[PDB]
Amino acid sequence: RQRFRFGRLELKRISGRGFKNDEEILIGNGTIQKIGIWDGEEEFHVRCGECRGILKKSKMKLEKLLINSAKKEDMRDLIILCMVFSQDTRMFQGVRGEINFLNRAGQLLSPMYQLQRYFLNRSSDLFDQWGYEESPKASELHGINESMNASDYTLKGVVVTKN
Numbered sequence: 572r573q574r575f576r577f578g579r580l581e582l583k584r585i586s587g588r589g590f591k592n593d594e595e596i597l598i599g600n601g602t603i604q605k606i607g608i609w610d611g612e613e614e615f616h617v618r619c620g621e622c623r624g625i626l627k628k629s630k631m632k633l634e635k636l637l638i639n640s641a642k643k644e645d646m647r648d649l650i651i652l653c654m655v656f657s658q659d660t661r662m663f664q665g666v667r668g669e670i671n672f673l674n675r676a677g678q679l680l681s682p683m684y685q686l687q688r689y690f691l692n693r694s695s696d697l698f699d700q701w702g703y704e705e706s707p708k709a710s711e712l713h714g715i716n717e718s719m720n721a722s723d724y725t726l727k728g729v730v731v732t733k734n
């Protein structure tokens with residue numbers, strides 16, 4: 572279970588096993604792109620900068636992300652990166668602009684890394700497409716909105732702890 576990266580995101584497996592299959596994904600800008608889609612419930616310690624979290628995913632779905640509160644920019648990037656890494660259907664649909672899967676020399680680019688790069692610059696569109704649900708009714712857990720503020724609605728599947 573060794574530490575590994577997905578760009579700015581760092582992960583370490585807690586549980587589960589994924590199996591990858593290539594699928595044709597309809598992305599939110601109207602294009603269809605072939606992307607390795609993971610199947611399986613998997614769970615990971617995650618990190619971005621000084622922000623720690625726990626992520627659970629299943630096929631094309633962020634099941635849950637529990638983050639330990641931290642500087643806001645690092646909370647926000649951790650959230651964006653977990654949305655991309657979960658391969659959630661809503662994340663794909665959130666892409667409204669152009670995305671290239673070849674560079675200017677005609678070289679091959681990673682669809683997932685390209686998504687990461689796209690969304691770290693377009694998080695408002697992502698949060699807007701992703702949506703909100705009621706925050707937890709427990710004292711030791713709080714909701715978080717698009718501004719990384721504690722709120723009565725939280726990004727779906729995302730909760731913050733101070734413990």
Ligand SMILES: C[n+]1cn([C@@H]2O[C@H](COP(=O)(O)OP(=O)(O)O)[C@@H](O)[C@H]2O)c2nc(N)[nH]c(=O)c21
Nearest residue numbers: 576577589591606607609613656681682683684
């Ligand atoms: C080894 N390991 C790699 N990743 C991710 O899967 C994606 C691989 O995408 P890629 O690097 O473009 O390779 P590919 O086109 O051959 O599919 C990246 O986002 C990796 O972070 C993985 N993702 C999951 N869910 N489970 C894993 O065990 C795992």
